[PDB]
Amino acid sequence: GIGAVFLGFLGAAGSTMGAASMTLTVQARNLLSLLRAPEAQQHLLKLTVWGIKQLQARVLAVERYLRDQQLLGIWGCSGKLICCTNVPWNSSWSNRNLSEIWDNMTWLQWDKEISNYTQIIYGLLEESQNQQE
């Protein structure tokens, strides 16, 4: 079930980050989206390893989703898609014009941009959500 929406995020790649955040609002509603045969005693323990193997996926798709929103809920917001917080943006994190970011870059570019700094922001998002509490 949930593993369907884990891949539907990728429908907005290649577009620009101002447009992909707007598509995410439509995608927000789009992320709101049987073996009953005569089974012999040889089919009984074989169609049940086909049952557990699919049900080890449906719980992994749930347990990955709760391991996401446990990490978001550390950074103030739980369940918010678009969430902005009370940390000021440091200038040394690949300084660029704000029109030179939301208008002429795709989201995959930011993986290449700030991945040297992505761990540092995560500790700041913990601390400022801990300093404010």
Add this chain to the structure above:
Amino acid sequence: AVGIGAVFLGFLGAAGSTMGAASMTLTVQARNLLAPEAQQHLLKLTVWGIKQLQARVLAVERYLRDQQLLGIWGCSGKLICCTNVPWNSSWSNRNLSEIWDNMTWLQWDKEISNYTQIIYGLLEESQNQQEKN
């Protein structure tokens, strides 16, 4: 089934009461609740075990699909939650004392269901524009 299937049915208690009376029960019910044959011992462990775990993960992903929808609107975990969308007065045009004192939720929801798609679009947009600016 034996998990969060009783919670979706326990919501349906105190239908026919007044809307103030259901609201008093909202936060308090979600505080209080959430053969000597070897052949039968096999099916009770193996295929009747899977089929009750296909219904406990169905009730999980029915629940997380509800608390995700409250996450777009901004609440995400508060049972009682009010927003910044102003109530249009062309929505049943009824008196606020006439609604909360003598009206049941079933009687109330039959009045409003003409346009509950239109309310659901505003609460997404207002939580898109309160995190934009």
Add this chain to the structure above:
Amino acid sequence: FLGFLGAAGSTMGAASMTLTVQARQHLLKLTVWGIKQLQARVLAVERYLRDQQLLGIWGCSGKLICCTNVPWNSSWSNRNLSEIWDNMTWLQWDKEISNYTQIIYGLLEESQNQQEKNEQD
């Protein structure tokens, strides 16, 4: 989705810090004992969702460490708060607070509940 989250928690300052760091035929043998390891996980999901509604009523949903506006009473095991984090295990708390955890959970109800009406006015 944790039911254990153990990581051998002994010393409390190491327990608090690592908590933010860590949790941030022959087919009959393996099908009976595979369902047992799915009843472990699926319960440990429904134990989380039951718990995060209880912290949500107190106002502390999602945040692992949360601080709140209820101070100690006098009969809530008054020891010094500097040695309490020095040499004590987390196991020694539930020994040390016995019947106070039920009224702490009641006071943390009304601390949010009066606050929901306070900001309403």
Add this chain to the structure above:
Amino acid sequence: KKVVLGKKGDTVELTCTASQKKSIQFHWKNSNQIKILGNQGSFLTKGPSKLNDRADSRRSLWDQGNFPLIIKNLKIEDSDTYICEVEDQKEEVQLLV
């Protein structure tokens, strides 16, 4: 208001027809509203009319929607009007010999 003519004795095939192909329940009544012939699930049934021994139907056609009525030994007294009631389409066919 259909028209069907017989001579005597012969088999007439009056016909009502639905659009479903799934063997839905019908009946057949006359001008005094007495049952001529009826379907009950997957079995046939008659009614206590004066065509109770003579009326018939084709069982294999019910699965394609077609619900006929086949009458043997046409006398003069069955010259009446007949009504097929599939779910609403109370079609009337009249008969003469």
Add this chain to the structure above:
Amino acid sequence: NLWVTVYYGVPVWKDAETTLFCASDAKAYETEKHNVWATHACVPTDPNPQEIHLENVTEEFNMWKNNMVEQMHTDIISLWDQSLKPCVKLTPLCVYRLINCNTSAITQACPKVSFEPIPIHYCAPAGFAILKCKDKKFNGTGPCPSVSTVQCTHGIKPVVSTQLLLNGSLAEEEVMIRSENITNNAKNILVQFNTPVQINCTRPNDIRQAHCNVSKATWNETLGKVVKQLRKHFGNNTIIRFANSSGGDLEVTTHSFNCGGEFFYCNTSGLFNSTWISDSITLPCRIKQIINMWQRIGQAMYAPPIQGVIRCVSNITGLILTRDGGSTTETFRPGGGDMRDNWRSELYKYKVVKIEPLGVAPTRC
């Protein structure tokens, strides 16, 4: 924080058409051919059915447009097709005036197997609920005054019989005359009982010649109970007289049940014959091997009957009549055969709804 709120947990329900699941109390070692089917197609019933009573609620039930009747009728066709495999199955194909209708003859391996029905429940899935009309005077349609919610209904025994609804469940006030519309002469008047009129069906030691004994005392007062509350529908002056069946197919002109795998055909002619002004009867039952299938349109041909005694004591807890529109006296010549009426007469007090626990309402925040 101005004027539009949301609540999560509101008591709202909208009617739905989901797919319920079986949930019967199977035994999984037997080879009684229901416990075979209820093993691989059901779940064990819950020990504690949570039943919430609803208070001051007036739902508008219906049973002549119920959907869970259809989901029972598909599971029971799926039961009989895996349990009673015929030796010869003559079902037509039919692939204008006369379309090509070839009558195929599937044959298969057909042993004799034990066959007595067990109570099947019908549990709804997560996010739905089943409403239940706890009023003991329910007409069948219309606003039920007292509703209760429940995961599944009571253990329903999927018997199959015409003219008589045996082993079923029984009313509580006097006798109900549930139908759809009594002016039509085309809707089967169901009738429940409040007393199980027992019937004793035996084959003793001709191997296809049986008899079924039913008491004249209990049947005269139970026909006495029905005949009072029919003149409350057709006027107190109608001298209503019961009668024989009118004719037609053999499975509906005779009380066609089965017992132990063998398909009895009784003869309820001395059972409905009494005019009504304002000891034990016996019934000449046969055993057929060439029956009409009730599942689809076909004919089956089974093995010869088993050797031994076949005693089949059961409770007549229901009738199915059919009125006769006269010129006057209203004669009730019975019928049946549409097998959905054996499951309309036990799933009448049920309705499956969809819980929509999200709601909006205005106030001042």
Add this chain to the structure above:
Amino acid sequence: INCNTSAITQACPKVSFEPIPIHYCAPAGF
């Protein structure tokens, strides 16, 4: 003296009887 020794009879064949080791496990959540 309100007690009475009820004798209960049944079939009683001859059996083999050696015990095997049995491991006690805990359910999910323990």
